[PDB]
Amino acid sequence: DIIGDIRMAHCNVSKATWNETLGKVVKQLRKHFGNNTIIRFAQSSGGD
Amino acid sequence: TLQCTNYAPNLLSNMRGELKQCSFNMTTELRDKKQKVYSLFYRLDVVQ
Amino acid sequence: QVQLQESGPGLVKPSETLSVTCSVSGDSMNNYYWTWIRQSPGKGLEWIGYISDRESATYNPSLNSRVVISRDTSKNQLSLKLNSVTPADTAVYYCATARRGQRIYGVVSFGEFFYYYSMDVWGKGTTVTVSSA
Amino acid sequence: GRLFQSGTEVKRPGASVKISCRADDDPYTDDDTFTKYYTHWIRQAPGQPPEWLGVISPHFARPIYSYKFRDRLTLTRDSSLTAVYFELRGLQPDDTGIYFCARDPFGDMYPHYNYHMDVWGGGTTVIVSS
Amino acid sequence: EIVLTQSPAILSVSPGDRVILSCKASEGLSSSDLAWYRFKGGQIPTLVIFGASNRARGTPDRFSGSGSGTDFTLTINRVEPEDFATYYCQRYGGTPITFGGGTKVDIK
Amino acid sequence: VRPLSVALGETARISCGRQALGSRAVQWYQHRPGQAPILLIYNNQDRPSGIPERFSGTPDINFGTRATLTISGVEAGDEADYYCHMWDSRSGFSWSFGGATRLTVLG
Numbered sequence: 001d002i003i004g005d006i007r008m009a010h011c012n013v014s015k016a017t018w019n020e021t022l023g024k025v026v027k028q029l030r031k032h033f034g035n036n037t038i039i040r041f042a043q044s045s046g047g048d
Numbered sequence: 049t050l051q052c053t054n055y056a057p058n059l060l061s062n063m064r065g066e067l068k069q070c071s072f073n074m075t076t077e078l079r080d081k082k083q084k085v086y087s088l089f090y091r092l093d094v095v096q
Numbered sequence: 097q098v099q100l101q102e103s104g105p106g107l108v109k110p111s112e113t114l115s116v117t118c119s120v121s122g123d124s125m126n127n128y129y130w131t132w133i134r135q136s137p138g139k140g141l142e143w144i145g146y147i148s149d150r151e152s153a154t155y156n157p158s159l160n161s162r163v164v165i166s167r168d169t170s171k172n173q174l175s176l177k178l179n180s181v182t183p184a185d186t187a188v189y190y191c192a193t194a195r196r197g198q199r200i201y202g203v204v205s206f207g208e209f210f211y212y213y214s215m216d217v218w219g220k221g222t223t224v225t226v227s228s229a
Numbered sequence: 230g231r232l233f234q235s236g237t238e239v240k241r242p243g244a245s246v247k248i249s250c251r252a253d254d255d256p257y258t259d260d261d262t263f264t265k266y267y268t269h270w271i272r273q274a275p276g277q278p279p280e281w282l283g284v285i286s287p288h289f290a291r292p293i294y295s296y297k298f299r300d301r302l303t304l305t306r307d308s309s310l311t312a313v314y315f316e317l318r319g320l321q322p323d324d325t326g327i328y329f330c331a332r333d334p335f336g337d338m339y340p341h342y343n344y345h346m347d348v349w350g351g352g353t354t355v356i357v358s359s
Numbered sequence: 360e361i362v363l364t365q366s367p368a369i370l371s372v373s374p375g376d377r378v379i380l381s382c383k384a385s386e387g388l389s390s391s392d393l394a395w396y397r398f399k400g401g402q403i404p405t406l407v408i409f410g411a412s413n414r415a416r417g418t419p420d421r422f423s424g425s426g427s428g429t430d431f432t433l434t435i436n437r438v439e440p441e442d443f444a445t446y447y448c449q450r451y452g453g454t455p456i457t458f459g460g461g462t463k464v465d466i467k
Numbered sequence: 468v469r470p471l472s473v474a475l476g477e478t479a480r481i482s483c484g485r486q487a488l489g490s491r492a493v494q495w496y497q498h499r500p501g502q503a504p505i506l507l508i509y510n511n512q513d514r515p516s517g518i519p520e521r522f523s524g525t526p527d528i529n530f531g532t533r534a535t536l537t538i539s540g541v542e543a544g545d546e547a548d549y550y551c552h553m554w555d556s557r558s559g560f561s562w563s564f565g566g567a568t569r570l571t572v573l574g
């Protein structure tokens with residue numbers, strides 16, 4: 001049984017350093033596709 | 049055959065479809081006798 | 097400060113429209129949630145229903161929808177209608193207020209919290225007896 | 230040896246089609262074919278050159294669509310490790326033709342990392358009218 | 360996007376000679392990502408060659424072909440009555456892949 | 468309905484029959500016969516105005532404890548029954564109040 005509260009597990013990440021890491025990897029990836037190309041992060045496709 | 053209904057009913061939280069309560073028979077060390085057992089299984093573990 | 101006065105018919109014939117009205121004086125009814133509690137002799141308290149700013153008359157499911165809750169903002173009153181009543185609920189009524197405070201145990205983003213209704217200011221309450229005689 | 234797909238279904242404009250391409254026909258089989266081999270789905274119209282329609286990976290059935298058929302094409306497999314599906318919602322009277330499913334290692338195998346569709350299977354037909 | 364064209368669209372030959380199936384690429388193929396298929400009406404389209412020049416399992420000695428850069432050739436040694444069918448070449452690389460239009464041999 | 472008999476001077480601990488399961492948020496009541504009910508303790512720690520500082524509840528730290536009401540300095544007129552309203556997570560929206568613990572002080 002569950003002796004307590006029915007809760008859901010959840011993973012926490014810090015927003016500021018994750019946004020800085022995304023900006024850094026975008027600035028790194030921008031060395032291969034010129035300057036004025038809009039890089040868009042999206043969700044997954046699907047499957048299992 | 050798992051007779052399985054919803055555990056923790058009428059909960060207004062997010063976790064509603066998961067945590068289902070099912071009962072089933074299981075064999076013991078004496079093969080003529082059985083044992084009724086109760087357990088909780090997730091939504092991704094049971095198929096109707 | 098919110099003050100509550102009561103009014104009652106007293107003598108009620110069975111199986112018709114019952115109406116017991118409490119009046120509010122002192123403030124408006126914009127945020128406080130009005131509820132009604134029935135106290136019968138021989139048992140404990142009983143929750144009839146409550147109303148909110150959503151104008152939702154959520155009744156108790158153990159009453160078989162025999163009560164009707166309504167409010168009004170133009171005359172500072174509220175109507176408590178009944179139909180097809182029994183002679184076995186001779187009880188004193190109560191008109192109370194209730195504030196809603198949230199209780200959070202996990203994260204608010206998923207909805208792992210709930211609501212309660214605290215009743216701090218109550219009314220005097222007038223008894224209503226129903227009988228065939 | 231050879232792949233198996235069935236179906237000679239007719240359709241109406243505004244519906245969806247379901248094409249299943251299995252390998253080794255008996256249903257209780259453990260071919261393991263959809264396990265380390267990519268699978269290509271290819272459409273061909275009569276009187277037209279064949280065009281690419283979509284590949285599915287054998288790792289966890291992660292699909293790779295094209296930009297022409299992106300928002301109206303979902304395809305995956307079931308709990309058993311056979312019988313990949315093909316759901317094409319948002320029909321049209323332009324894609325009337327034959328459909329093919331081909332096995333392809335796609336440069337993931339151990340010998341030589343080749344690029345070839347070694348076997349194609351069946352080839353169904355989809356028509357639509359009113 | 361690399362468009363794959365084929366200029367010998369219509370071909371006719373007798374059984375027992377060598378035929379040339381040429382294909383032109385748009386801009387600089389990698390010379391290792393190309394395939395040839397033998398299509399027919401209401402049959403099983405099988406493969407005949409790997410990459411630039413490498414035979415498959417069910418392929419005899421008479422099927423070969425090479426090419427590099429932007430030109431790719433298929434060189435059949437002899438013509439059989441079981442080979443009078445259309446051919447389709449395709450490339451690989453970035454999705455979506457594109458076939459090479461279409462060519463066809465005939466008996467005359 | 469459960470009776471209780473506590474003499475003068477010493478304190479008393481009153482529990483309700485509803486076994487709490489989860490995060491608790493109780494509202495302890497007190498109803499004199501004929502008068503109006505009043506709110507004593509809400510949200511397990513707080514107390515409204517006008518109520519004396521003699522009623523202490525139980526916090527929600529170290530879940531597994533009993534939600535009781537402590538009456539320090541019991542006087543002679545404490546004959547009104549109490550009500551232990553239960554609001555938790557698993558049982559959902561509770562409608563009824565519960566058993567009325569009738570405290571009868573002697574002397």
Ligand SMILES: *[C@@H]1O[C@H](CO)[C@@H](O[C@@H]2O[C@H](CO)[C@@H](O[C@@H]3O[C@H](CO[C@H]4O[C@H](CO[C@H]5O[C@H](CO)[C@@H](O)[C@H](O)[C@@H]5O)[C@@H](O)[C@H](O[C@H]5O[C@H](CO)[C@@H](O)[C@H](O)[C@@H]5O)[C@@H]4O)[C@@H](O)[C@H](O[C@H]4O[C@H](CO)[C@@H](O)[C@H](O)[C@@H]4O[C@H]4O[C@H](CO)[C@@H](O)[C@H](O)[C@@H]4O)[C@@H]3O)[C@H](O)[C@H]2NC(C)=O)[C@H](O)[C@H]1NC(C)=O
Pocket residue numbers: 010012199200201202203204205490491510511512526527528529
């Ligand atoms: C990933 O991240 C997410 C967030 O992004 C994390 O979720 C967070 O999870 C924790 C618990 O795991 C939640 O804490 C809970 O909060 C509720 C209510 O929130 C209170 O805190 C707010 C913060 O403000 C200060 O106050 C607290 C003390 O209350 C300080 O300790 C803090 O440091 C802050 O400085 C506050 O804004 C709230 O608002 C209310 O404030 C006052 C007080 O009531 C009112 O006047 C206001 O009007 C308004 O209503 C509120 O104060 C708490 O209730 C929870 O504590 C209770 O439950 C515990 C477990 O049962 C128990 O141990 C506690 O003792 C407590 O029980 C009793 O204690 C109080 C003591 O005074 C009593 O008064 C009270 O009645 C109660 O009965 C709990 O602490 C976060 O809210 C949640 N975050 C969000 C955004 O929802 C997640 O955990 C992360 N995951 C991982 C893996 O890292």
Ligand SMILES: *[C@@H]1O[C@H](CO)[C@@H](O[C@@H]2O[C@H](CO)[C@@H](O[C@@H]3O[C@H](CO)[C@@H](O)[C@H](O)[C@@H]3O)[C@H](O)[C@H]2NC(C)=O)[C@H](O)[C@H]1NC(C)=O
Pocket residue numbers: 386387388389428429
């Ligand atoms: C990775 O893929 C790219 C893209 O296909 C490959 O680049 C291509 O390389 C060929 C040479 O092998 C280039 O062809 C050349 O074209 C010029 C004219 O542009 C011509 O003058 C030369 O004689 C030659 O034919 C081709 O243009 C080039 N494509 C692109 C888009 O740059 C590359 O070879 C692949 N492999 C790696 C990087 O290992």
Ligand SMILES: *[C@@H]1O[C@H](CO)[C@@H](O[C@@H]2O[C@H](CO)[C@@H](O)[C@H](O)[C@H]2NC(C)=O)[C@H](O)[C@H]1NC(C)=O
Pocket residue numbers: 095256306307308309
């Ligand atoms: C084995 O059992 C699973 C679980 O039911 C089957 O998967 C479902 O199959 C039905 C077929 O009508 C689909 O409608 C469901 O969507 C499937 N559930 C999924 C994918 O989660 C599976 O088909 C069974 N295998 C057999 C009978 O060979």
Ligand SMILES: *[C@@H]1O[C@H](CO)[C@@H](O)[C@H](O)[C@H]1NC(C)=O
Pocket residue numbers: 012013014
């Ligand atoms: C995660 O855990 C570490 C453990 O030390 C802690 O320092 C940190 O504050 C926690 N939270 C986040 C958002 O990283």
Ligand SMILES: *[C@@H]1O[C@H](CO)[C@@H](O)[C@H](O)[C@H]1NC(C)=O
Pocket residue numbers: 019020023
């Ligand atoms: C992320 O970092 C960039 C730094 O260039 C900043 O401009 C931006 O406001 C940050 N936040 C988001 C949500 O992008």
Ligand SMILES: *[C@@H]1O[C@H](CO)[C@@H](O)[C@H](O)[C@H]1NC(C)=O
Pocket residue numbers: 030033034035
């Ligand atoms: C993109 O911008 C950076 C700015 O530092 C520059 O160095 C780089 O040359 C630019 N890319 C191109 C293709 O000009």
Ligand SMILES: *[C@@H]1O[C@H](CO)[C@@H](O)[C@H](O)[C@H]1NC(C)=O
Pocket residue numbers: 049050051071072073084
């Ligand atoms: C276990 O077996 C008995 C034997 O008749 C049956 O009545 C019972 O329903 C079984 N248990 C379950 C959970 O089906």
